[PDB]
Amino acid sequence: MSRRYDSRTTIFSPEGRLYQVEYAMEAIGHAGTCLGILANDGVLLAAERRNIHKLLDEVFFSEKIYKLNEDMACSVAGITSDANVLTNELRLIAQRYLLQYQEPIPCEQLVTALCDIKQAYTQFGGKRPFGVSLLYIGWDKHYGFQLYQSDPSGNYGGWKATCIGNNSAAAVSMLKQDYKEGEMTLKSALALAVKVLNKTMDVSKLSAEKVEIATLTRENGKTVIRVLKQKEVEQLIKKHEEEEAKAER
Amino acid sequence: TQNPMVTGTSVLGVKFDCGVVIAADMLGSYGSLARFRNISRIMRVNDSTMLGASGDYADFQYLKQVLGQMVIDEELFGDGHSYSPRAIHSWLTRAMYSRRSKMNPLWNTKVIGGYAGGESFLGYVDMLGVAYEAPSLATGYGAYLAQPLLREVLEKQPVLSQTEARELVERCMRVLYYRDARSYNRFQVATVTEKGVEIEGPLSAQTNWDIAHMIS
Amino acid sequence: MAERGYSFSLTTFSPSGKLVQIEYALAAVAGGAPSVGIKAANGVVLATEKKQKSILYDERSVHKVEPITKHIGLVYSGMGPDYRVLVHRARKLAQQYYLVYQEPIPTAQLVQRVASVMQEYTQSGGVRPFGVSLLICGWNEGRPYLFQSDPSGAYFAWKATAMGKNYVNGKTFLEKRYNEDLELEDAIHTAILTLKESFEGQMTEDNIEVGICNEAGFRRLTPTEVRDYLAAIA
Amino acid sequence: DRGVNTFSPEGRLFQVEYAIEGHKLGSTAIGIQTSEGVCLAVEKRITSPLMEPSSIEKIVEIDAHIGCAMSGLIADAKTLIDKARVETQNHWFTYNETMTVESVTQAVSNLALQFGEEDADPGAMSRPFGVALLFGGVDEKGPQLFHMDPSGTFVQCDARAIGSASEGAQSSLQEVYHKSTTLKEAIKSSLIILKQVMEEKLNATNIELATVQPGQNFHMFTKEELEEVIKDI
Amino acid sequence: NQYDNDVTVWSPQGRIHQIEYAMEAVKQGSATVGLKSKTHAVLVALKRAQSELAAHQKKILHVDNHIGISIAGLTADARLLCNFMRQECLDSRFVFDRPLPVSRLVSLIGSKTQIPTQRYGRRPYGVGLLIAGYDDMGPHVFQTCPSANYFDCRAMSIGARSQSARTYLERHMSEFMQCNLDELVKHGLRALRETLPAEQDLTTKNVSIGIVGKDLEFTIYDDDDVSPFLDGLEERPQ
Amino acid sequence: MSSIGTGYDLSASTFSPDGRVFQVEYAMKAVENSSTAIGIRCKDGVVFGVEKLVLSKLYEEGSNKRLFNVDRHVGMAVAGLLADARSLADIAREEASNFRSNFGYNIPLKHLADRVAMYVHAYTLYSAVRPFGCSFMLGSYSVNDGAQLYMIDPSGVSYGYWGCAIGKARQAAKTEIEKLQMKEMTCRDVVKEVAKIIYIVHDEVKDKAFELELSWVGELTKGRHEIVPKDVREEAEKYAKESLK
Amino acid sequence: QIHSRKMNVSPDVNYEELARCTDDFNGAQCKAVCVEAGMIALRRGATELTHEDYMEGILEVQAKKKANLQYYA
Amino acid sequence: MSRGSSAGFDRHITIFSPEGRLYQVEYAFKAINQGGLTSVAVRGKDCAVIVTQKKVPDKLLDSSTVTHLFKITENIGCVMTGMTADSRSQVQRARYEAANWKYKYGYEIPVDMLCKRIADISQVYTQNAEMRPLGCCMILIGIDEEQGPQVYKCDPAGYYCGFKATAAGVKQTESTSFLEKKVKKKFDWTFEQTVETAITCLSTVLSIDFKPSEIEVGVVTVENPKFRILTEAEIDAHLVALAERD
Amino acid sequence: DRKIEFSLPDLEGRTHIFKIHARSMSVERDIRFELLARLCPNSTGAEI
Amino acid sequence: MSYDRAITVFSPDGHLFQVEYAQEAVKKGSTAVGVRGRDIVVLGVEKKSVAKLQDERTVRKICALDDNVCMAFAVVASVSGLTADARIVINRARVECQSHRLTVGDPVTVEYITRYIASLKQRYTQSNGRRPFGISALIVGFDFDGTPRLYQTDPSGTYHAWKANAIGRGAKSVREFLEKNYTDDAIETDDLTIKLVIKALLEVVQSGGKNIELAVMRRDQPLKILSPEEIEKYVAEIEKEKEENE
């Protein structure tokens, strides 16, 4: 090209290839890292909240990691403003699935329902593209614990370790590298989660004001999802902290 | 074959068509069931400057029709500087409305007689509760159609159109007969004539009496 | 072509990856009246500069600290129309909430629902975002709340923040003076000082309105009541 | 933001002038009217013999007894045909006789210029048809072939050839066919003309032949059936 | 150019160019004569053609078998109104049950043609239509042009080089009312010959004739069914 | 420049730094291209006098459509682009049609003019449809408030007048109306008066050759809007000719 | 009108009628048109400029050319 | 230049300028200066009074028929200030909103609520991509049957603020300043007082002083259960009183 | 006096000029040039 | 906004901008080849974009829309391996196919779904705001008749049947390559049908045959995806014969 034929999504690209999506991917990198690691009794999500400021009202512990359903939770990397419509939408879909199927909703099914809305916005209706990558964490009895990655465009993939945010390229390779398979436990995936989160992020300290950590753990055959509170979060950070400290001068 | 139990009725609308005029007589009385609530009542309306409409049977169903024919006439005159609407389009479109409302089994009949000239021809049209449009020599609808119209038919049978004088004697004969034979009405008639300037027909006044068969 | 079309639209994305539009909306609020909100942790205070100067404002049915429901108030900055629709929808949503649970809505659930709505205008194209930044106060569950909802359609948790004229300077004073847990009466005194930084032309006999939210509930306060606090600390 | 239509200073639509140029790029359609049928002959526009000549949407059915051949933008044509198709099959259900080839032609010419978007209509197009069509079918007065083109010009035709050279396609028709003569020869003439506008020499693979007769009605040809009409080059 | 790309761009004259540019298509398109007596309405048309292996384009169209039109301009826009008008007729007998007045329909189309000239960018319909009709009132020769303005006229001629036809109609303003079905047709040919060069006159194959009036319903005459009407060849000046 | 002819009229979703969009100012120019329509108000009706521009003498009645019948007591004389003239006729008329059905009585002009004026301004707001660009008058005789005359310009401003003229000779014509009397006198005396103003104003740098059309809407025609009779028209015209010379 | 004085005044040209047909032609362009009208007339074996002659002249002078793209032109 | 910036979408379709205020909204205020209608409204305790130029340029116009005082409720009244094209469109819109409300609530409308509600409607016009904000100001008068006389004013975009005394127009800043002195040194109100104070401040700013057939003064008094237009009879009486008053 | 929009040679005009050059040099006669001209868009004399 | 920018403008090209441009995308990312056989019409894909920690069950590059029709695609655009655009098209085309069964029974024919899909992209060219999908799908299947068909659709929405057709990594290149391998013998034999697919894929071989996934589908029967392990058996032997021709 030499000029876009976009300026609306009710008019389209001078190549028919959508530039806006590549700027959206860059948008996840602007925002803080989101990572998901797999465990053999749970799955956990670790995300960097928008708020770093000391003054926090703290009525919410969920401000980027939202528990949607009685089987699944998701996280946001990107603009916070976008999650609010999405999170309420996800709640509707998630319970919608239960009504008909009444099964521990699989991660692949929830993500495909959402991808229908994101692909339409980019095609028509004059709505601006999304700028969030969401990580869905859940349990089904047919493959186990799963992690899925959704992109602004509607592009999806099942992972068991994936990271986006604070330069995606580096982060996904690193998360993989430190990940091990079938050697894991929930406490050690959590200790590791802070460590990797620390390296991708500029900070070498990190606090529960900066970070918000969620578990999804299966107990007595049913999935209990909680986003953890600050004192509990701090304990995972301090566990990591001794190691981080030795790296430093 | 139908006739709803009417509450507020105009019983009779007389009509005979002549050479450039129509003479219509319209019942003054408005029966609301057995009680005659209102006499003053002219059921002939002025739509426009060359049309008139006169209806008998339910008066409510009439008042709903007069405004509707008013909006149809208002659309049509806009197109010319002094164009006026022909009888047939407005009366026929209303016919289709009454055929549909007849099928809906709770409804009330009205039967109207329109006189207009909007063509190159003077049209005398009817829309009925049952619906149909036709020409007629002399016409009467509703309760007229049932009992005087047959007297009119008798006349019409060897002499296709009556004279002015003979129609007046019949009118006078007729009002007696309706008060005597039908209930709701009165003798009282308004004489209304429509011409190319509008409709003129002053307030309903009393005319010849005879509910006596003591003399017979 | 140039940057002009691409960047401004919310019918398609900014090429920056974040929308230049929400940033524009904050500038609007800067041109607005100065507003401070502070959760003491004994109650919440919302205070704003209200233009009387001779008493040119009806204060008998129209205010700048205004109740959404029984125990929730809002104080605002920026564009006036955008806000009025926002109030009326917000109260509507609250009333649906009071109807169902039989409890007036708390600030923390309300901002999130309110944010969903403001996001829709930030998504829709041809439709601009709401150009009001809201300070929501409340006391529900036995705990006072203060939240900030920005024009983007996002909600952020704060114990004390500043909006309106010179917000950068407000946030710096708040962090400096404010301590976790305080008395609601001391809290008004620093709020009147927070306004006083970038008031413009200074307070007359009364040219502020303050509303308090506490245990008994959110109430906007009368010009006389308001004046008593201003003598203590201008 | 902007309009839709733009008139050129010449006094005619810019988009309509472009739409004519649109025709030059594609397939060719020849239809030859005889009182024994209407035949439509069109190329698919070949590039490999792996492309079947057995079943290819270039001659498509508007009705059971009306076939329509397209030239210009092929793809867009299938949408014009679909709209004509719904009107035509409703008329066929009702009449149980024939649906005038002429009406159908008049109906499609409405779709050529109707287009609005950008605060006019979401139900109307953003483009003009750069399709030209030959509707050939059998009717109660007789077998009729009608020509429509991007300007919307509905005209009745005894014989018309339209292709990637409009001047070329007709001029070959002058040489070879004459209005009145057998059914078999009308097909014969379609193929010769078709070869002339086309790059390459005639083969079974390059074309699809469909004849609509009052005697047989629309027949979509398969490969065995194609070899028969090829015999007469 | 710029005004007509949009419509909301208004001119320094104060008149939209999209309408003016639309009028120029009418100048490209076929010459037509439409004349009335006071018993009949006659449409005398010049047919144009793309091939002479194909039958010359029928320029009298059936809207109803009592009103018909002759088109000058964009053909696609014409056909679109043709169908629109046709349905209106069908509607009129369906509900009202009578032959549609020409006068009710020109006004109705005049309301509809205004709407896209006002819609952003959209066309005014670059076609001028001459509706010849005989209804219950008698004959009407109506002009709709690309401007929503319509004329009620006794005789007018629209299309390519029709101006030359219009001058001869002015001389013969008196003759029209007075004329019979035969006579009025010979004047339409006279008017039609002006359009064409002073090198040539009318042939049977480029003339299409449509007659509706008191004598007979709307029948359209094609390629060589024009002939009994046709005979009458008058002056063409240099 | 108080207007730009390219820039700030690219869409109808614009404003301009003075406060008024240029498209509306152009729409006043559109009315200047056509002849004048005058309408002077009595207390027994309104009488219109419009000069109709002619190019042929094969024209018959219902040509140009300078007089429209909005209702059976509302008259309209128009000036400006005839294309635009038909839609404004529809807008006033549809409002009238709904009104007649529901309310069941003759429309007061005080309500109609503001009500219509809202609609005329409403196209200007939208970029779904372009501003109007013909100007019209509403003149009514009713028992609802008497004879009343309003003028609504394509901007969407409605004002009262005893005498309004809209054209390219509106300024010159309005002053001329003020010198004459017609305010209290009958429609029969007035008709003569509407004709003469048109001839005296009639310039050769604002208008072209015309045939006169005048119209009633008052007590003589019994409410309803009709065109004046040919015989009457010619006496009103005969005074109009004499008065110029 | 002024141009018809320059050449000759035919009974055929009618200024009122002519004005309607065409749109947006100015003085200079018009002079070219009258010169063109004359070209047509010389071919005919005429000196008169016919009404049809003026019209035709209009089309040659612009960007437009014989044998148009359009199938109505 | 001027407020806002042409760059990008903000006049093609309504999407915010750098200022964070719509391009059209800032321009929207300028639209009052286009109008030439200069208004001051003063609030009593017995009436709410509005005084405005009626803008009758010639007596060829009928003084009665020309108006800018409208009856928008059952006794709530308003005056229009600014571009007239905007002003009639706002009036008619306000009227719909007014009727619906009266029914629902079931009693006559507070002046405050009516101004608040029109203020919500005007945001709608602002937000929609086809439309553009109104350029006019509606000044509502009415007596709330609790609080007393209230004078409200709505801004072009649909801003709402409370007022007990207001002015709007070309010379908005000057009119509000003359009235500000009068509010401070508040007189006790009666029908006559309130009216005298409204006219006097408007006549200082303009420095012409009104004719008794060129202004329209509109009141909602306790004695009328209707919205009433003062007309030439009443205004003439206050006008001769002004010269003599001080 | 006039403006003429200069347009590329029509289909007959390009066939005719090619024919003239073609005969001069060694070409096989029955030439496929016609099939190619019709297939292709407007082509100028320089081009042929 | 500019004339060129707008979705409406038929362009000197003589064809709508957004339809033209979608057509220039049918090379690069992923590769889909389908050849016709008597007993199985077989499609094969190379590149499911799998790191082999990514689920291969989630990404479908070979999805069965019916119970006798299946399709494989490829396409060009911004951001690699892009599941989304292809995935909406699978969802609407598959439901429509199941809805067709419900309306008018038995497994739906190859040619009908292909007609539906080509028209689906076409209708969008009229529809508001909508450009056509840039996708070419190799619709592979058997009819209810059992007549094998191999169909291909293009981005404008014109469709043609072929005996064998290949797209992606340069559409034109893979089509040309496949034509040397195709023979009338290849269609009759069950071993050769698979190898013909694999033979087009290999000229842009990446990561084994485990990367390459093939399916055979039969006359009325569901999609059978041959193991990622079976595919490898063909590739080792064939790859050697492949080097020689190019």
Swiss-Prot record, chain A:
Keyword RNA-binding: no
SUPFAM superfamilies: N-terminal nucleophile aminohydrolases (Ntn hydrolases)
Keywords recorded for this protein, A-Z: Acetylation, Cytoplasm, Nucleus, Phosphoprotein, Proteasome
GO terms for biological process, alphabetical: proteasome-mediated ubiquitin-dependent protein catabolic process
Positions of post-translational N6-acetyllysine modification: 127, 176
Modified residues (Phosphoserine): 13, 75, 173
Pfam families: Proteasome, Proteasome_A_N
Regions crossing the membrane: none
GO cellular component, one term: nucleoplasm
Chief location: cytoplasm
Keyword Ribonucleoprotein annotated: no
Tissue specificity annotation: Ubiquitous.
Matches recorded under InterPro entries: Ntn_hydrolases_N, Proteasome_alpha, Proteasome_alpha-type, Proteasome_asu_N, Proteasome_bsu_CS, Proteasome_sua/b
Cell compartment(s), UniProt: Cytoplasm; Nucleus
Protein task: Component of the 20S core proteasome complex involved in the proteolytic degradation of most intracellular proteins. This complex plays numerous essential roles within the cell by associating with different regulatory particles. Associated with two 19S regulatory particles, forms the 26S proteasome and thus participates in the ATP-dependent degradation of ubiquitinated proteins.
Family listed: Belongs to the peptidase T1A family.
Subunit relationships: The 26S proteasome consists of a 20S proteasome core and two 19S regulatory subunits. The 20S proteasome core is a barrel-shaped complex made of 28 subunits that are arranged in four stacked rings. The two outer rings are each formed by seven alpha subunits, and the two inner rings are formed by seven beta subunits. The proteolytic activity is exerted by three beta-subunits PSMB5, PSMB6 and PSMB7.
Record-linked NCBIfam families: PRK03996.1
Originating species: Rattus norvegicus (Rat)
Encoding gene per record: Psma4
UniProtKB/Swiss-Prot annotation, chain D:
Phosphothreonine modifications at: 47
Locations listed in the record: Cytoplasm; Nucleus
One GO term describing the cellular component: nucleus
Protein origin, superkingdom: Eukaryota
InterPro entries in the cross-refs: Ntn_hydrolases_N (IPR029055), Proteasome_alpha (IPR050115), Proteasome_alpha-type (IPR023332), Proteasome_alpha_type_5 (IPR033812), Proteasome_asu_N (IPR000426), Proteasome_sua/b (IPR001353)
Main location: cytoplasm
Keyword terms: Acetylation, Cytoplasm, Glycoprotein, Nucleus, Phosphoprotein, Proteasome
Residues the record marks as carrying a glycan: 190
NCBIfam families listed in its UniProt record: PRK03996.1
Subunit-level organization: The 26S proteasome consists of a 20S proteasome core and two 19S regulatory subunits. The 20S proteasome core is a barrel-shaped complex made of 28 subunits that are arranged in four stacked rings. The two outer rings are each formed by seven alpha subunits, and the two inner rings are formed by seven beta subunits. The proteolytic activity is exerted by three beta-subunits PSMB5, PSMB6 and PSMB7. PSMA5 interacts directly with the PSMG1-PSMG2 heterodimer which promotes 20S proteasome assembly.
Primary role: Component of the 20S core proteasome complex involved in the proteolytic degradation of most intracellular proteins. This complex plays numerous essential roles within the cell by associating with different regulatory particles. Associated with two 19S regulatory particles, forms the 26S proteasome and thus participates in the ATP-dependent degradation of ubiquitinated proteins.
Similarity-based family: Belongs to the peptidase T1A family.
UniProtKB/Swiss-Prot annotation, chain F:
Modified residue annotations for N6-acetyllysine: 57, 206, 230
An annotated Gene Ontology molecular function: ubiquitin protein ligase binding
Subcellular location: Cytoplasm; Nucleus
Reported tissue expression: Ubiquitous.
Pfam families, sorted: Proteasome, Proteasome_A_N
InterPro entries: Ntn_hydrolases_N (IPR029055), Proteasome_alpha (IPR050115), Proteasome_alpha-type (IPR023332), Proteasome_asu_N (IPR000426), Proteasome_sua/b (IPR001353)
Keyword annotations: Acetylation, Cytoplasm, Nucleus, Phosphoprotein, Proteasome
Keyword field contains Protease: no
Family indicated by similarity: Belongs to the peptidase T1A family.
Record note on quaternary structure: The 26S proteasome consists of a 20S proteasome core and two 19S regulatory subunits. The 20S proteasome core is a barrel-shaped complex made of 28 subunits that are arranged in four stacked rings. The two outer rings are each formed by seven alpha subunits, and the two inner rings are formed by seven beta subunits. The proteolytic activity is exerted by three beta-subunits PSMB5, PSMB6 and PSMB7. Interacts with AURKB. Interacts with CDKN1A. Interacts with MDM2 and RB1. Interacts with the C-terminus of TBXA2R isoform 2. Interacts with DNAJB2.
Name of the protein described by the UniProt record: Proteasome subunit alpha type-3
Name of the coding gene: Psma3
Swiss-Prot record, chain J:
Single GO MF annotation: identical protein binding
Residues modified by glycosylation: 136
Modified residue annotations for N6-acetyllysine: 233
Positions where Phosphotyrosine occurs in the chain: 159
GO cellular component, one term: cytoplasm
Keywords: Acetylation, Cytoplasm, Glycoprotein, Nucleus, Phosphoprotein, Proteasome
Keyword Nucleus listed: yes
Pfam family, one: Proteasome
Tissue-level expression: Ubiquitous.
PROSITE patterns: PROTEASOME_ALPHA_1 (PS00388), PROTEASOME_ALPHA_2 (PS51475)
InterPro entries (alphabetical): Ntn_hydrolases_N, Proteasome_alpha, Proteasome_alpha-type, Proteasome_asu_N, Proteasome_sua/b
SMART domains the record matches: Proteasome_A_N (SM00948)
Main location as per UniProt: cytoplasm
Localization annotation: Cytoplasm; Nucleus
GO process annotations (BP): proteasome-mediated ubiquitin-dependent protein catabolic process
Protein family (similarity comment): Belongs to the peptidase T1A family.
Self-association state and partner proteins as the record states: The 26S proteasome consists of a 20S proteasome core and two 19S regulatory subunits. The 20S proteasome core is a barrel-shaped complex made of 28 subunits that are arranged in four stacked rings. The two outer rings are each formed by seven alpha subunits, and the two inner rings are formed by seven beta subunits. The proteolytic activity is exerted by three beta-subunits PSMB5, PSMB6 and PSMB7. PSMA7 interacts directly with the PSMG1-PSMG2 heterodimer which promotes 20S proteasome assembly. Interacts with HIF1A. Interacts with RAB7A. Interacts with PRKN. Interacts with ABL1 and ABL2.
Protein name as annotated: Proteasome subunit alpha type-7
Organism in which the protein naturally occurs: Rattus norvegicus (Rat)
